Amino acid sequence: KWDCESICSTYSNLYNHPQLIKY
Amino acid sequence: DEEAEAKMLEKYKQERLEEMFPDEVDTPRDVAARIRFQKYRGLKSFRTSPWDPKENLPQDYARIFQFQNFTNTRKSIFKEVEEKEVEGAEVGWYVTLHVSEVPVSVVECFRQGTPLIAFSLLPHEQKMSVLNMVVRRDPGNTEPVKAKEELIFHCGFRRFRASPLFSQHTAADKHKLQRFLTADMALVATVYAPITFPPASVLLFKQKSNGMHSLIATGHLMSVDPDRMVIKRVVLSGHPFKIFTKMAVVRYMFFNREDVLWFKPVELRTKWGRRGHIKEPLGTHGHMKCSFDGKLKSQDTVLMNLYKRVFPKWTYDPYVPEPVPWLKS
Amino acid sequence: KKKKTGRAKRRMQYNRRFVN
Amino acid sequence: RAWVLEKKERHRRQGREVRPDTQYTGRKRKPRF
Amino acid sequence: HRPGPLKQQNKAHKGLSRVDQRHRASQLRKQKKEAVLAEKRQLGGKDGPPHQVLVVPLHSRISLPEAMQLLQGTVHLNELGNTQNFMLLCPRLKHRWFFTSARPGDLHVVLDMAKVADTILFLLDPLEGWDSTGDYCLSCLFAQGLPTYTLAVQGISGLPLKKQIDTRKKLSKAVEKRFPHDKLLLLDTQQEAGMLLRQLANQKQQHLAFRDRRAYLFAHAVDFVPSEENNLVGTLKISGYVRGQTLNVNRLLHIVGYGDFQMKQIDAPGDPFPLNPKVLMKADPGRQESLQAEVIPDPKVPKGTSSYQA
RNA sequence: UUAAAUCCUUUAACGAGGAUCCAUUGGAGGGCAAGUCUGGUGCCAAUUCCAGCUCCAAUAGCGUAUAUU
RNA sequence: AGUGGAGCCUGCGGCUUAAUUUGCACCCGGCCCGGACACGGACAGGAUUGACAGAUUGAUAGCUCUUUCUCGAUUCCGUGGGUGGUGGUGCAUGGCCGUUGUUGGCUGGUUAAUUCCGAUGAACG
């Protein structure tokens, strides 16, 4: 069912964000 | 004793393989190629293809800091230190400072004869983040340096032992991992370290067996941001044993059958510039039928590129041993 | 090996150029 | 390199002797100090 | 496509006085000279920190103690376990010196005493330029960042006269591959020592940006008050001259080999070595004092049927 | 030699095979002198960047900038 | 007159498949053999050759898995970005064919049969 391109659909990009130092 | 010589020879062998074949890794005959290379993807073009900087961040990036605008933060802090007048001890006064919680060892060191200096940190300079520092190898040291071995960093009055990553110094959005520190150009060492505002000099030392630190690098702290990503590249090689008109049958790149199906959406290429796409598995032994743009010679080798985002290892050590005094071997 | 210098380099260049 | 190709085609149309066109037509020999 | 005669083409129709300059240049020169005078007077004088000189011999035949005896106007001979760093007062020349020395190869010692040096005095021998240890030290020192430096040679007059001039010429060539346009002073006598001190005092200072943007100090005196001796942790009283910027106690203090700390109090005792012959001014409180958090404080099939047939 | 010296000159002695006692600086595959070359690295065979080989010029000298002729 | 409509067959695509070869080639399993050079190892304490029987195997087989009998230097293990040789291929290259007339000259079996097989030269232009 999965291959090397469609598996990139299940990756999240919002969990381990470093602390953001504002300006 | 001699195991050090054996490891040195093995490192030399790996270095010459890496300079001769950059990222070609033989496919494992026992483990499935869709398992050992599970955390890999293919890119149509290394420079222009996108990659999310926030994607799949480890536990380590949960522990570090990041600047929303590092340029404007440097501008703000530097204008604050050049313009504002802080109510404190001014330059030239012989002051005494009472600092709270320090081990007795420094005091013993001070009766040895070791110089003990101190400096006041700028704001936000004690928090840890990812330090990107540009280095170049001096010709005095030619021993192999592998990508993630422990080195001694002198960076901006600060000494620490840590394990870096070597990346190419290019202008693109993503940078390829260098598995070895090549002694011809400038590379980027990426490490976990406390924040330091540039300019700062970057000295890299390797600890020898007799206790001396040998100097290997030299440079400047480029930037402080974890958004720089390192990209480990693995190249799989295949042999086109049957050639047809604008068609080939390739073996030895894969060995399972579903390995071919897993890595179908990755564009292929050859050593002689001819690109192509993989059509279909042949069966049960990893043979595949591929469609190229032209005819292929029998000496050609089909190549495949896989990319995985790599990150430094948290080996921050603020202890550096005091060396024996250096002498030429 | 080393290349000749001076009058000898010109002598070599002349022997190559006008002798043959 | 395309500028060199146009100038060589100019010289070809003018009918004088022109170097054969290869992969080393326009390529920087070295940095200049 | 080139149109011919049958196509319609129409040719287009063509259609401060001398005294004012002198006075302006006078004003600009006066401004620049005033600024340079302030900059040169702040270092080594009676209103500023002592001029710190790091003496590094670059060869093994060099007698460092002889050089330090020539470099010492009264001298206050501070001393440690092995090294001899001394305070020098020249009120005839009106300058205050702090002389430290270091042997090449001792990495932390040379790198620390070169990252707080105002000037570096390299020592040479007449015959060769420097050792391989001297070459290694110079590579690390160049790569870290050099302050202003001067080159002194020790044994020219020990040679026979008939070679000396030629020897110096040879030495110049051996220096020129790393120090291209630099004068080789001689350090053999007291007179040459005074000439070297004069060259040191009046010279264009090289400025290092990193230590210029931050407040730093070289510890002249270190005292320990252990809160509990069995705990092996106590307070440090570190006494020295502030060098880089205004020292604010509400920022962290990093000791170079041992990491950063929170500092509590700044008192200002009398200057032990003023140029021309106990009050405390600051407090700790943590209402604005930064905390030493380097890491985030927030935590149906038969038996013989094959899989094919199935 | 010279005020005294150095240098030069003059002379004993040692001092040449890879005579390693090792000549450099620039330019050439678009026109004056001189290229049907090689290998890496990317873009859609052409094509960015890097390192060489070969050739030409003058030579204890040869490039560069600026001004001027 | 049709085809394009319908059923069947067939050709390119596409889909399934281990293969549905391609502009017996394809697939699934089992045999056979696969340099020297250099250096470091084992080797007459024995290197190595052959082998019955039984079995594994879709089947048998010293070409395999057991059990010891024999042959003895006829050797066999590993690492090289070093060549390479039962290799493929072009050129010059020496020999040799074919190419651009005339007149002469029977032991054997077998069949209807001097049938069948079977042994078995000259000159002229």
- The set of residues with CB closer than 7 Å to nucleic strand F is B 22, 44-48, 271-275; C 1-2, 5-6, 9, 13; D 1-2, 4-5, 7-8, 11, 18-33; E 162, 165
Determine contact, residues B322/B287, Cβ cutoff 8 Å: no
Token digits for B324? 């024996």
- Provide the token pair at A22: 């504002």
All residues of chain E having their beta carbon less than 8 Å from the beta carbon of residue B103 are 232-233, 258
- B88 contact partners, CB below 8 Å, separation of at least 6: E246, E247, E248, E249, E266, E282
Query: What is the C-alpha separation between B63 and B311, in angstroms, rounded?
Result: 14
* The token pair that represents E287 in the structure block: 């209402």
Q: How many CB atoms lie within 10 A of CB B308?
A: 16
Contact B/C (≥3 CB pairs under 8 Å) = no
Strand E279-280's sheet: what is its strand order? Answer: E221-228, E233-241, B94-103, E263-268, E279-280
- Which of E65, E66, E72, E73 has the alpha carbon at shortest distance from E86? E72
**Residues A4, B65: C-beta atoms closer than 8 Å:** no
Cα–Cα distance measured from residue E37 to residue B263, given in angstroms and rounded to the nearest whole number: 72
Q: How far apart are CA B76 and CA B71, in angstroms?
A: 9
Q: Which of B85, B98, B323 sits opposite E265 (nearest CB)?
A: B98
The answer to whether A1 contacts chain B (CB < 8 Å) is no
The CA-CA-CA angle for residues B316, B320, B322, to 5°, reads: 175
Query: Determination technique for this PDB entry?
Result: cryo-EM
b vs e for B259-292, b when ≥16 Cβ sit within 10 Å of the residue's Cβ?
bbbbbbebebebeeebebebeebbeeebbbbbeb
- Record the resolution, in angstroms: 3.0
Task: Give the nucleotide nearest to B48 (CA→C1').
Answer: F43
Cβ proximity of B263 and B253 under 8 Å? no
Residues E213 and B196 sit within 8 Å (Cβ to Cβ): no
SS3 category, A10: helix
Q: Which of A4, A6, A21 lies at the smallest CB-CB distance from B65? A: A21
A23 to B76: CB separation less than 8 angstroms, yes or no? yes
Helix (H) or strand (E) holding C9: helix C7-14
Contacts of E244 in chain B (CB under 8 A): 91, 119-120
Query: Which token pair is E183?
Result: 């004068």
Residues with CB under 7 A from strand G: B 17, 20-21, 242, 244-245, 247, 257, 280-285, 287; E 308
A16 contacts in B (CB within 8 Å)?
A: 57-59, 61-62
Distance B92 CA to G69 C1' (A): 101
- Determine the distance between C5 (CA) and F9 (C1') in angstroms: 29
The partner residue sitting opposite B68, judged by closest CB among A4, A6, A23, is A23
Contact status, residue B94 vs residue E222, Cβ threshold 8 Å: no
- ∠ CA B104-B106-B111, nearest 5°, is 100
CA of B45 to C1' of F42 (A): 9
